[PDB]
Design a protein. Structure first.
Ligand code: NA
Length: 220
């Protein structure tokens, strides 16, 4: 529709529950006349007072989403939409669109002791080579070398050809679990990709690196 947005995605920095922080979206009224804009839904972890405004023309206004983590929200990657409802007083009415807002929410580590935290060891680079038309599986061993249980709060992929699921989400000291990875070359083809280079993102209770990324490569 008429409204144009600075970003399809907004991403808070890695944050602890008490962190403050702000993400900025610039919306712009493209077509001709008045746009009436309502922010009809906000992520549960953000604040916005600029919620119901009028817009004249061009690329005029700014929205500043303040971080407000709900008390007792657990750590992990949060992905929630900012929902924008646009009504053109004259030329019709409605278009609805959303911007995905992401938060890498981690543990409050200064409040945790060594007996409560893990240390993650794994391969962070996986080149799967040439796949030639079949869904291809791999497994990365995730190891806990810490003194406490290693907890995998979230394991997320953004690429639609890539999935990753750990066998367990809590790993005792000296123990390990498999991260089962699958790449779908048919999805890559349907998307006109000859190759991918995509991250698996892991949020965990490793105090030295609570957000860990595995780069996965694959070609058709
Ligand atoms: Na995916």
């Amino acid at each position: 529709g008429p409204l144009q947005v600075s970003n399809a995605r907004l991403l808070f920095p890695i944050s602890m529950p008490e962190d403050e922080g702000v993400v900025r979206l610039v919306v712009n009224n493209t077509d001709e006349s008045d746009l009436q804009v309502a922010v009809v839904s906000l992520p549960s972890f953000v604040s916005l007072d600029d919620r119901a405004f009028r817009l004249q023309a061009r690329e005029p206004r700014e929205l500043n989403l303040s971080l407000a983590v709900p008390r007792n929200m657990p750590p992990g990657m949060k992905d929630e939409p900012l929902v924008l409802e646009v009504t053109s007083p004259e030329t019709g009415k409605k278009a609805v669109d959303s911007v995905m807002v992401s938060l890498p929410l981690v543990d409050n580590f200064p409040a945790l002791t060594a007996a409560q935290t893990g240390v993650m060891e794994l391969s962070t680079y996986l080149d799967m080579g040439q796949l030639d038309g079949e869904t291809t599986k791999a497994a990365i061993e995730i190891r806990n070398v810490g003194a406490g249980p290693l907890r995998l709060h979230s394991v997320t992929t953004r690429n639609p050809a890539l999935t990753a699921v750990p066998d367990r989400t809590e790993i005792k000291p000296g123990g390990s679990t498999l991260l089962r990875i699958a790449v779908d070359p048919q999805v890559m083809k349907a998307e006109g990709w000859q190759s991918i280079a995509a991250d698996i993102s892991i949020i965990c209770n490793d105090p030295q690196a609570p957000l860990r990324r595995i780069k996965v490569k694959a070609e058709l």
